[PDB]
């Protein structure tokens, strides 16, 4: 069945959505650990805005803490609590 | 509260997830239309695999058709049915 225009619009508009983010992206300076799992499920801003002069950004943010296996190759591993930014509310704002 | 290691692992493992894909990405050769909405909600493969030699890819695929506003700037606009690839099943496969 065809998805209807107003549905496509409504489901795709700038909102917080479960997004799988690579941990190396959130901690770009880790030159020592490999992570397992290598990505985490975070609420983040996704979708699109009416104008192309607008962009989809977070208004309200919060932290979530997850247990990740941290491996230093040939040197050891442990489970460590790591913190990630989540987006609770998004809005379309000027660039 | 802390998300537990086996939960993080289970929620992040290679599976089909609702993903907001830019339409210009799925139709990279459209040098004529602007699209509204500019992105669509598609099931696609996301997450991560146990090895870094593995990657997360689709096994089973299907098509979905959505009504999108297609604008040719200064020249007109209409609603058009566009087709997008969805992923019904994903698995971790060697690179």
């Amino acid at each position: 069945e065809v998805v209807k225009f107003m549905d496509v619009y409504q489901r795709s508009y700038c909102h917080p959505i479960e997004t799988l983010v690579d941990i190396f992206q959130e901690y770009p300076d880790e030159i020592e650990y490999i992570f397992k799992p290598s990505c985490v499920p975070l609420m983040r801003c996704g979708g699109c805005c009416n104008d192309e002069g607008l962009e989809c950004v977070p208004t309200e943010e919060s932290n979530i803490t997850m247990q990740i296996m941290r491996i230093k190759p040939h040197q050891g591993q442990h489970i460590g609590e790591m913190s990630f930014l989540q987006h609770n509310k998004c809005e379309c704002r000027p660039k | 509260e802390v998300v537990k290691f086996m939960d993080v692992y289970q929620r992040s493992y290679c599976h089909p997830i609702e993903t907001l894909v830019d339409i210009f990405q799925e139709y990279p050769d459209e040098i004529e239309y602007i699209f509204k909405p500019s992105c669509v909600p598609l099931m696609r493969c996301g997450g991560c695999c146990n090895d870094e030699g593995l990657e997360c890819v689709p096994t089973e695929e299907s098509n979905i058709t959505m009504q999108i506003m297609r604008i040719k700037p200064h020249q007109g606009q209409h609603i058009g049915e566009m087709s997008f690839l969805q992923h019904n099943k994903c698995e971790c496969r060697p690179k």
Partner: antibody
Amino acid sequence: EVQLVESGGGLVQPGGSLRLSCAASGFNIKDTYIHWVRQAPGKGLEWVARIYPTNGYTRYADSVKGRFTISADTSKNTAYLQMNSLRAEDTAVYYCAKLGIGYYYYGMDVWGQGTLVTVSS
Amino acid sequence: DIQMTQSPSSLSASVGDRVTITCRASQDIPRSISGYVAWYQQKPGKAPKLLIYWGSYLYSGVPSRFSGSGSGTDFTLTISSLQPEDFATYYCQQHYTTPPTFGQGTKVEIKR
């Protein structure tokens, strides 16, 4: 099944040499660390050496560093511990043990049966 | 590189009792870190068997009266309902910083 079988122990004179073998079945040691652990009579477990077979990286306990050499032949699926300059304190049961990598690194779940090395004249 | 100090050195307990064995890391490690200790059971003259891995996970085919927990520097192995077959020496192992070192062992005697 997954298995390790040691051989090559026995009696050896002080100052002498001995080579221990460890044959892996059911898995490829290329995906693995292979370790030697020893137990002197009535004493605790003592980690002694480790090899990463693919790249041939080795680590050793201070008590044996310079005298012992660990290696692995990936094509025979076998690991070795060359022991030189033996002393009374090296008398022990010597175990081979496997650790996996990444999510497969959780502990020594596969051991050999142990081989007694006795250093005496 | 860390050493583990394991305690007690020996203990004696009755069938059905709760046995608690402890492993402490030599360096200061925050409570946010966990999952770096394995526990083994060694019957006399045999190879050790893995009981618990990553601090708290029960290895396959090991009776569920064995459990483990810990964080920071402090790890615990618990046998919730001691059985006669549980006579053994128990060892911890750290892999926070490898090469992975063992504790000195806890000899468990069954009091009958």
